[PDB]
């Protein structure tokens, strides 16, 4: 998939030593035409029993269950997509679903209710089929989320900073500690450099992408 492209893009920026070569002109790497369409605005890790629930920035929700199936609820509050482990998709609604999906729909509704009532929406200030969560994992320092549109999002726990990587735009959005949201073209970070903080996070991102590539299926 496009993970290989993402890895190549990150190799290229990291190899350019963007924080170690003199005048850094990070602002000139910003490219508003690359702003992502979707990212994860909230998440709930209940994976010891059920799975990982999440909200996308369009107020849709989803769950990646521990059996590797997914349920997606569109922001209309009724339309549902069910995705099997193999990626096979079917459509239904909360109002009309097979009884076999009863338990999973109930769980989705609990996750949805929780993420409607609680937590801050990441990227809240910011305004193409709906992606689903292909896979995820967590380390001690971050949660890594891989969307079916090829995007990879990394949220760092301690300082609340976040990266949204898109291999189609070859771009990274960095959400900093003050929740400022800036989208950069990766090749322009090569061209113009960046601060050591972003540089360090892009090195970490490369390692996370290698982990995704080495743990497929």
């Amino acid at each position: 998939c496009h993970l290989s492209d993402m890895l190549q893009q990150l190799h290229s920026v990291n190899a350019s030593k963007p924080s170690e070569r003199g005048l850094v002109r990070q602002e000139e790497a910003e490219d508003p035409a690359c702003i992502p369409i979707f990212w994860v605005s909230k998440w709930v890790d209940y994976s010891d029993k059920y799975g990982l629930g999440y909200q996308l920035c369009d107020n849709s929700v989803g769950v990646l269950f521990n059996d590797s199936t997914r349920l997606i609820l569109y922001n209309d509050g009724d339309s549902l997509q069910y995705i099997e482990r193999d990626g096979t998709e079917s459509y239904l609604t909360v109002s009309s679903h097979p009884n076999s999906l009863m338990k999973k729909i109930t769980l989705l509704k609990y996750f949805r209710n929780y993420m409607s009532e609680h937590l801050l929406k990441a990227g809240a200030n910011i305004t193409a089929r709906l992606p689903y969560l292909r896979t995820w994992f967590r380390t001690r320092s971050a949660i890594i989320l891989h969307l079916s549109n090829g995007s990879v999002q990394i949220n760092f726990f301690q300082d609340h900073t976040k990266l949204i990587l898109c291999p189609l735009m070859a771009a990274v959005t960095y959400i900093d500690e003050k929740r400022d949201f800036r989208t950069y073209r990766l090749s322009l970070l090569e061209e113009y450099g960046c601060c050591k903080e972003l540089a360090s996070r892009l090195r970490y991102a490369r390692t996370m992408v290698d982990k995704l590539l080495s743990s497929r299926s």
């Binding site: 909230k42 998440w43 709930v44 890790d45 937590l119 801050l120 990441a122 949220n155």
Partner: peptide
């Protein structure tokens, strides 16, 4: 953490 901010 077990959920987001």
């Amino acid at each position: 953490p077990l959920h987001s901010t």
